[PDB]
Amino acid sequence: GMRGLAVFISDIRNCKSKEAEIKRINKELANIRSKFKGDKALDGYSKKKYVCKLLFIFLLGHDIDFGHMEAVNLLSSNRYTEKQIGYLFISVLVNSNSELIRLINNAIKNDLASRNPTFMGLALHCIANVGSREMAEAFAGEIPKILVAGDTMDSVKQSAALCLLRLYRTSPDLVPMGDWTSRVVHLLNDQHLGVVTAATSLITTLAQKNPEEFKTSVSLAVSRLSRIVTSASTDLQDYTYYFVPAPWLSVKLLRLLQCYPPPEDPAVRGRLTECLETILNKAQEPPKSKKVQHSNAKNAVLFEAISLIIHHDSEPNLLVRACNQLGQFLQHRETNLRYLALESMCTLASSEFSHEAVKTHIETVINALKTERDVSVRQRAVDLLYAMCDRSNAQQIVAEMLSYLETADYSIREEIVLKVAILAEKYAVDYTWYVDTILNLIRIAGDYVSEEVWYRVIQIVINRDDVQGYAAKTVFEALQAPACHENLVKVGGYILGEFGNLIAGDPRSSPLIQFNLLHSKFHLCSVPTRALLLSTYIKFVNLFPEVKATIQDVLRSDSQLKNADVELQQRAVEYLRLSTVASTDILATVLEEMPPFPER
């Protein structure tokens, strides 16, 4: 084609600096402006190429503030390559100049009014690509006529239909529902599947506000779909992609049908059912190719059919079949398929006909999460577990969430900790389970634990004698990992101040060992945390008189009594003073077991 164009492009590439690039572009702009302005007329070859060079520069980022007039001339050329380029320019560089617009509309009019489908298509595309009101106003009335005329070529019908659709979306008021409706519907019977594909996109948009007017499309849409999904190898060769027949038209026909309720004609509803079952069956057949393109094309159709089934929410056998197929995707190479399967299953969980089916796949979801690498898939796995959780499920789901938590990334912890607390609250069977869960939650992921939540667990433990000794041992054995969470030291220190006595008799969890364990955390803690441990330590002087001397030792120390903080300095003094100046009977009065909380 255009030698001057290739040269400019390769000159641009050889530039060694943005500075040089901008020099070569300004040079071209001067050249183009001269020639456009100059005395000598240009041959079309030149108009064509220079317009096309200006477009290149526009696409590189630079401003183009002339040229539009020259590209408008190209529209009236009888040479395709010249019109193409003219039409491309005005489609990518739209100006608001109302002389040009009027001029561009004439050019359109001639091309539409020629009978040349190549020229018709260029103009139709221009309209669809720009979509301006002035164009809608000039042509919106004409486009349906082109679309339903018995003589217009298929490609022109395809392009007319999508043009009409663009115009309907930008300028609805110019697209009334005239007499062309039934014949647009009739296009769903065209032999040319490209035409059928195009018409379907249009009717789907039109059916959104005009359902009654395109109600006839259902029956046609259903019989087309069923001929497509059962047709042989040697049928629809043009529209067969990696052994999957018309995947995109299939998808589109399934999508049109989501604008309507289940087919009112019992015959039609029946055909549609055979149809959907055929699709479900094919999912269970093995690949005809090991190329990922085949399974994706096949599964696009499968997923769109699953939406239809969900939207109709009216055939329980198909919904169950749907769950089970999605359940089989949950073990799959394709992260894509895992992703979509979980997403789609989340939907099915909230339907009555389908909730229980979904619960069936709990183990598979849990195994998938357990091994899953992609974060967005993990997230959707946890969302699913949440969605299906109930009285039966809850202990298993919670066990498994907690287990996963023990080795989980940081990416995902926060949301799981949150879900564990909430589910624990909704579904706790016995106060001991709740307690065993939260303390563990706190042990593993205490950094994300609401303060309120460790409050709760500390009150329950007070109000129930039966779990106190369990809570004490759990905390103690937890506290004795070399690394642990601060809220564990808050929860742990409080429980032990209050109930350390129930394990103090074990010689491996003695009063001394308890204390020194806490104290190996103390100076790595926040101030309110130490504030609590100063209270814990004073309960210990009382409960375990044997270790009063080491504790008084830490209270008299500089880091406590000359502490920069008010609470710490106030507690360490108050407490030393208590242990020193208080009668034993007094000390016991002050640090009795705290009374049970009120339940309200």
């Binding site: 950094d447 070399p482 601060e486 030291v489 926040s526 000359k562 609470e567 003073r577 002050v590 640090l591």
Partner: protein
């Protein structure tokens, strides 16, 4: 599938044809375009034979270009760059120093099994070369090889080769041997390379002058590692080291400083010389604060340590640590620290006048720390206390919200260090009760009113107002309010029974904070119990606090002082840390990384 992969046309094929053109200026341009490409992520692996053939050249610029390309593969894809080992062996023989050094550096930046075979002999040859640019490289490459696996006794032979290299004609060569060595020695075995080194010190301390800014830096660091035994051994090392400032402003100084500090304390404290060296060290440190900002920061972080170990050195030089309004926050803040550490009776006049400058500026973060700094000054120097408190009052009456609330938190710590001394002020503080929204400030007012209750006949209707919205208060504020209102009872048991029961009833019946609950009960079990015995536990005199909060355990400090140059002297932490634990909450942890302190 394999779409867009074709190598029968497009950019790669165009470059392949240009790489075979027989005009070298067109080949040179190719290899540039290819390198440019790798950098932007293009696959250019297919061009590898074609690029490697461009090495068959007279032309230097061309050959060097092919090397750069091969170095790009060295790290990213090591198997790739192995394909051309046999060229490196030839090109380390080639009679151009420039090429010899080019083939060696590159051989040792590759990393697989099959590197050992080809590299050992040619390195053996390179440490033995008329050109000190070749031996400078070879040396560093001994490090490189060491990092590649295997103990290697022949490598142990290279370990000698390196030692022999420390004695050499050229300070560039010796410098890099040493730096290779100290790095080598650290990892992995212990006590390696130990020498009597009196020659070594001398060889290094003659080297350490004619040397380039880098050569010394390594030298010193290695040197500092040693432990002398005598006065006069230590001594003359120190005088030899002394000219270093400021060879290379930044690290040359601080590596000298490190050395001079370890050995310094081994000295008699005589004055004779000990005292001279200590006077020497003031100038060069102070000059660092005229460098670029990054390097200031490092120098300050270091000076901060040095000032705690030897406050003597910079006792006189507070002037340089004064804040310039356009320093980065991190250099501003570090300086502030040091001003407190050098603050002294002699200088408060000005310091205090400066801090007042800063506290009136538009950088909130920096303002807030400056009022703290004033308080830290009053706590530090008893004579300043009275003037500081005056300055703090001035500021409070300027009414700038965030200045008021910091100043008052400071004022409480001041009331605490100097009890029963600033009572008059308390009404001047209550004038501002409305304008406190931060939780710290509130608690400082509250605690203030709890102490000194009796000075205020109105201490009533104050602490009433703070009960109104007793929740929506910081649990810190609730705890302080609790203790302050039980302080008001033991002090004025009259109108108090109102409050005391209301506040004990909230902590005990309402609030879900179990720690607060516990504390409420505790007080309830003294007060609504026995009027007398509670006075001793609560109103008992609390001792005085001092600013040993900032100071580092002397044990640690010595360790950090030994690390003067390094990261450890920036983080203020033993290496084993950044190279038994409580994991703070995300609340705590995210919170901490904003406390400029």
């Amino acid at each position: 599938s394999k779409y867009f992969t074709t190598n029968k046309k497009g950019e790669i094929f165009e470059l392949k044809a240009e790489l075979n053109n027989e005009k070298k200026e067109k080949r040179k341009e190719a290899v540039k375009k290819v390198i440019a490409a790798m950098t932007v992520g293009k696959d250019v692996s297919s061009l590898f034979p074609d690029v490697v053939n461009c090495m068959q050249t007279d032309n230097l610029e061309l050959k060097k270009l092919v090397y750069l390309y091969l170095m790009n593969y060295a790290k990213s894809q090591p198997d790739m760059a192995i394909m051309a080992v046999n060229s490196f062996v030839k090109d380390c023989e080639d009679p151009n120093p420039l090429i010899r050094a080019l083939a060696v550096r590159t051989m040792g930046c590759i990393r697989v099994d099959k590197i050992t075979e080809y590299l050992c002999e040619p390195l053996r040859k390179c440490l033995k070369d008329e050109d000190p640019y070749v031996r400078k490289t070879a040396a560093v490459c001994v490090a490189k090889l060491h990092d590649i696996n295997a103990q290697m006794v022949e490598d142990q032979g290279f370990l000698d080769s390196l030692r022999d290299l420390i004695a050499d004609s050229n300070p560039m060569v010796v410098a890099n041997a040493v730096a290779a060595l100290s790095e080598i020695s650290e990892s992995h075995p212990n006590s390696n390379l130990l020498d009597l080194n009196p020659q070594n010190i001398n060889k290094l301390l003659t080297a350490l002058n004619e040397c380039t800014e880098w050569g010394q830096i390594f030298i010193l660091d290695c040197l500092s590692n040693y432990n002398p035994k005598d006065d006069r051994e230590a001594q003359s090392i120190c005088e030899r080291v002394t000219p270093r400032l400021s060879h290379a402003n930044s690290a040359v100084v601080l590596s000298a400083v490190k050395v001079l500090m370890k050995f310094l304390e081994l000295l008699p404290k005589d004055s004779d010389y000990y005292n001279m060296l200590l006077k020497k060290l003031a100038p060069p440190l102070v000059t660092l604060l005229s460098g670029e900002p990054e390097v200031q920061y490092v120098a300050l972080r270091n000076i901060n340590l040095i000032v705690q170990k030897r406050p003597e050195i910079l006792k006189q030089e507070i002037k340089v640590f004064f804040v310039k309004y356009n320093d980065p926050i991190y250099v501003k803040l570090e300086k502030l620290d040091i001003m407190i550490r050098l603050a002294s009776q002699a200088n408060i006049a000005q310091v205090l006048a400066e801090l007042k400058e800063y506290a009136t500026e538009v950088d909130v973060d920096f303002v807030r720390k400056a009022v703290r700094a004033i308080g830290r000054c009053a706590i530090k120097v008893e004579q300043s206390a009275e003037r500081c408190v005056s300055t703090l009052l001035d500021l409070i009456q300027t009414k700038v919200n965030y200045v008021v609330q910091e100043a008052i938190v400071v004022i409480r710590d001041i009331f605490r260090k100097y009890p029963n001394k600033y009572e008059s002020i308390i009404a001047t503080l209550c004038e501002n009760l409305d304008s406190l929204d931060e939780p710290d400030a509130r608690a400082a007012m509250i605690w203030i009113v709890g102490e000194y209750a009796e000075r205020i006949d109105n201490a009533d209707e104050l602490l009433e107002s703070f009960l109104e919205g007793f929740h929506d208060e910081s649990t810190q504020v609730q705890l302080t309010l609790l203790t302050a209102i039980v302080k008001l009872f033991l002090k004025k048991p009259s109108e108090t029974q109102e409050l005391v029961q209301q506040v004990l009833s909230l902590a005990t019946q309402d609030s879900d904070n179990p720690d607060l609950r516990d504390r409420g009960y505790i007080y309830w079990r003294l007060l609504s119990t026995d009027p007398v015995t509670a006075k001793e536990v609560v109103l008992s005199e609390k001792p005085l606090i001092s600013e040993e909060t900032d100071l580092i355990e002397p044990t640690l400090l010595d360790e950090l002082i030994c690390h003067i140059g390094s990261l450890a002297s920036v983080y203020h932490k033993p290496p084993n840390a950044f190279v038994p634990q409580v994991i703070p909450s995300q609340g705590d942890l995210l919170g901490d990384l904003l406390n400029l302190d």
